[PDB]
Symmetry: D2
Subunit: 377 residues, 4 copies
């Protein structure tokens, strides 16, 4: 009776990005991969080392290629091995940090992951679908020695969809990303709010906003306004949620309005020169008392996604962790990994809504890393 | 746990097609629908007095619309009712008998089905409220829509296997006897209940969402009738279908076939058939996949119909496939669609009856 | 330098649909084909009678398949001939009258058409589909063997013709109300190569390939009928212009509003027993003037597409004339559809370059004169 | 009567890539762009200058957005400017050197091009994308502001130019071999309109799902020694060298080396793998590509033309290892298109090349037209 499965995820201190050791292949081995909230699928570099007794490449026009949504047939002029076959299916994979994309082949192999009643036994998808993507794609932008990307996007062979389908889980997943490199957070597949902590009602304040999917397969929500200490800075789906930037990203005109109203809410004298890659920094000794950021979601009548000033700030000298996305970012506002860390964020694919707590996880005395004991497993 | 779910399916003697009573809505009610093996999705006429407590039409750009692969937004300039909303998602539904297609609206409601047993549910089963003109011609009497079993993201088997965590496969046991009911079993039937002699052949899915296999040869009573660099190939070229009762052949294959079939025997053809008799029939052997392949065998009498006539039609110069196997060739034959392994399984101690398998 | 190309179009009185003879093949022959304004392409019956020295079925993955936007390969077991090949590309064709669709194969052959009255000029490699013959069985005017699509799709007639000869990316329909005189489709910039009372409204294309405009309001004798970052839910106009239906079609709620308001513009006593296929019929002779229907385009004060009431009326029986507006039920593809009868005796400029549809705000005086 | 249009394109010595100054906007200005033979469209960074009186961003669901194959609507939260509007269309653009792709906005403006040496003729409503600026940051030749695609895609350079002027649906490349020198792209039927094309041979052209031109190589020999097989082949200007899948690379480079004396080999200069002392070589081996099928026509590469001057006294084999999964097992780069007439016939789905060298007629690509 499997109701949840759970993947440990770690915060990479050097990049601010989140990544995981996936258990794949026969025998099981650890494959380090970026966690890309918006990614279409799981892809890894197979050009390398690849040992498995259970690896298979589906044939062109197969049900597996249809499920993966590719009718592009490929062939390789060379002895067959993972990544190189006669008559297989081709899939474009994306490095979401550089935005590079390249052509690889669809593969199947074992993926293993812990079940959890709400720690539990290790269960497997014996023919988990993924792509052997070309190696140039791992060369830039990813945490050291990452070999791939696990996409959690709403696409037919993404992690959440493949896991939910195989185990009959509710078609949703919950992220609890860690703020701290020293301790692993979790991604929970299945209905966490109903099937999952130690007397604490961590979901008590869950509120919901509608979820859309862009044509590029990204999760979008809609922000009705941004207020900083009750002063509105915006206006004047639409909002992407993403783990391919650590920081909040704002379209340039929104960036200028935001940062200026932010500054204004602090003492003018507290401003110091900026350290890269930030624009707006402060002497932190000079004032502890950061403005609160309310994102009013969907429509004027709430609910409110609250960001405390302190959690927007980076200990760089403290700097505002908000980036100028230029004239044409993909979304006018993007909530990045730091906005996800230490919050329970529910992506409900069945009902098309994102759930979020109006109150802080930590108010329960709980950190995302406290959720599961991965050291026993 | 649940590892098997079953839909009773009924043989309609007047059309030669099959149909199920789907259980939907709150409170549950019965929705007669044609079973279309290659259908993309379940659709229904929602002008047919739609009562439900649990009906929703997903909004444009939602997760459900994305899953159904539509980014087309619609609005109905009318009040709000099932099939008429503002800001919902459009999708094309097909009447696969007439081949008509029409733009309808993505809906969500409860569907109930039997486990193997008791009735279990998909609270959010996705389907389409299709335009009512699509139920006017060709369907079995009183049917209100079509339930698609094609390999497409919101087809019946995909939704059910995903919800219950079944093995990605379904088996077909249609009954030959008009008014009798066989079943479609979802999940790993071969391991979860006769499946000793399962041959197997590769399955491809066409761009239009149809199941294909490849037929290397056809014989009538042993007589031959038939016949990451990018590449660019084709599917099998033989379609399995329940949207025709009859075997359909490309004109030239049809001539060869029927003629050779005539020669295995010693009247005034009766419409729509081109070869009829008074009332031993020769056997048809289909070598599957390639020259070494397992053989799909249809005994002659099972091709034959009573207007007795050869139930093999002329699909003209350009049918979808060179060869199509219709409803009658699936009847009283256990056909396993393994979507996880991309192959179709079939029965090479007589056959019992599809109608014997269950009791509802 | 060729500036226009012109195709005569015949009104079939028996169906109200419009058809043309397309000149193709080598040797050149006539192929009678339905004119489908919203159709993706030209499709034609290749069932075995087809024969031509210049016909080829492009190979899968060819530039011609790429242009037609199909990467679906097929093959045929019989001896090779048009419609039947070893490695070709598949294309879905639609009968717009019955809404049947079916898979056929991309074909290529010579098409000839008159320049500007001028000589016959040719497109040597004109792309079209060999469609399954079941597609011609039903709903097509007599003897029709295919459908010429004028849709905004990459191998439609207007696009191929404009492209081959370097015409302006537009065409003008001037359908005839009278079967005995043929009207014209004019490819290229008709307004600058042949009146001035042209109004324009934005043109959008639906995902199924249809032309849409936006009707801000429908009025009858000025009375309102209709009615009282990734951007997300945008839609195209919501009014379709089609030559696949003869009459105006309205979604059932709009239909009822329209009929109630139309009727209110005339004496209740003039009404008479309904006569199929119609729902609102009148004692002819008890009416001197029928209400005008004004479609205000784009915005509440945009340009107006005006229909005279006489032109929306049909005479069914001896002394009884009926309203030529059909009930499209709950889910027509568009809430309002203007049909062949609304396009007859009017110039309509489909400008694909500027995405606008242009129509006269003073109809000639109520198409066959332009050419001969 | 316009039959050909020609674009001077210049060889960049640093990157080995080719680029062009496109004349756009009102008033006209020079917009430097990389020439990407497989590029889907023309894209530019609009953030920067963009001065024009004739720029326009089509609206969502317009005929222009449909042509470009996008039904994705964009809103920009800012005030109106090029690259930033409400209700426009989104298009993904690709930097073909880094393989980065990003979302930009469909735009329309004037593009001027020389007709035939002849006068500047214009496309008033030329479609392109305002692509996000991160796409220009790496790997393009210095100062280029975007990319001009020549792929077989509906709004590519050759398609828009052929359609606007009624050209034959083909183009010929004559890329110049020497740094800063100028070759030409000629749109229209170059072979029939200006024998240097007397010996044109032809091989089937296919288009991949990512929109790249492909042909098939049936075999490769070096000095008549078999290298391949034991043949999908992309033609590209986004790599300056030949690229081979790893097992083909190993065989090719081995056989190439053993045709030369083994003491000729010096230490490898990055990025190359096989380099030589250029004192110790007097003749390089011929590389022969049999196209399409066992008995097809032969694309001949003189071996000297495969070699790169890495240093003062060192010459390297300009053949790169594409690893396990390059897009095509063989790729013919910029260097293989240099000083060679290559005809991309989109109408007939074939690529044409001369069995006899352009230099054996005494001609160089830079000779064809006098630009300035």
């Amino acid at each position: 009776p499997i109701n949840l499965v759970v993947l440990p995820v770690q915060n990479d201190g050097s990049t601010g990005l989140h990544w995981a050791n996936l258990q794949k292949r026969t025998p099981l081995m650890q494959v380090p991969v970026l966690v890309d909230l918006n990614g279409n699928h799981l892809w890894v570099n197979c050009e390398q080392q690849y040992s498995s007794k259970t690896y298979q490449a589906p044939f062109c026009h197969s049900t597996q290629c249809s499920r993966a949504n590719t009718h592009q047939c490929l062939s390789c002029p060379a002895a067959s091995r993972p990544g190189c076959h006669k008559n297989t299916c081709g899939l474009m994979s994306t490095n979401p940090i550089t935005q590079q994309t390249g052509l690889g082949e669809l593969g199947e192999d074992v993926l293993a992951i812990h079940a959890t009643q709400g720690l539990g036994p290790l269960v497997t998808v014996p023919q988990f679908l993924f792509s052997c993507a070309p190696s140039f794609l791992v060369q830039k932008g990813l945490p050291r020695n990452t070999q791939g990307v696990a996409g959690l996007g709403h696409a037919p062979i993404s992690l959440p969809n493949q896991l939910a389908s195989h185990f009959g889980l509710q078609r949703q997943f919950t992220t609890c990303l860690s703020r701290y490199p020293t301790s692993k957070g979790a991604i929970i597949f299945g209905d966490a709010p109903n099937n999952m902590f130690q007397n604490q009602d961590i979901f008590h304040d869950l509120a919901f906003t509608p979820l859309t999917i862009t044509l590029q397969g990204e999760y979008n929500v809609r922000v009705n306004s941004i207020r900083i200490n009750q002063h509105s800075v915006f206006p004047l789906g639409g909002t992407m949620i993403s783990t391919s930037t650590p920081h909040m990203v704002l379209q340039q005109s929104v960036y200028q309005a935001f940062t200026q109203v932010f500054a204004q809410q602090l003492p003018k004298q507290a401003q110091v020169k900026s350290v890269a890659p930030f624009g707006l920094c402060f002497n932190s000794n000079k004032i502890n008392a950061y403005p609160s950021v309310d994102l009013v979601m969907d429509k004027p009548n709430g609910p409110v996604w609250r960001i405390s000033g302190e959690d927007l700030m980076v200990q760089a000298v403290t700097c505002l962790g908000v980036m100028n996305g230029g004239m044409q970012p993909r979304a006018e506002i993007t909530l990045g990994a730091r906005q996800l860390e230490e919050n329970l964020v529910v992506f409900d694919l069945a009902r098309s809504r994102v759930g979020f707590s109006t109150s802080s996880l930590h108010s329960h005395g709980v950190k995302c890393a406290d959720l599961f004991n991965f050291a026993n497993a």
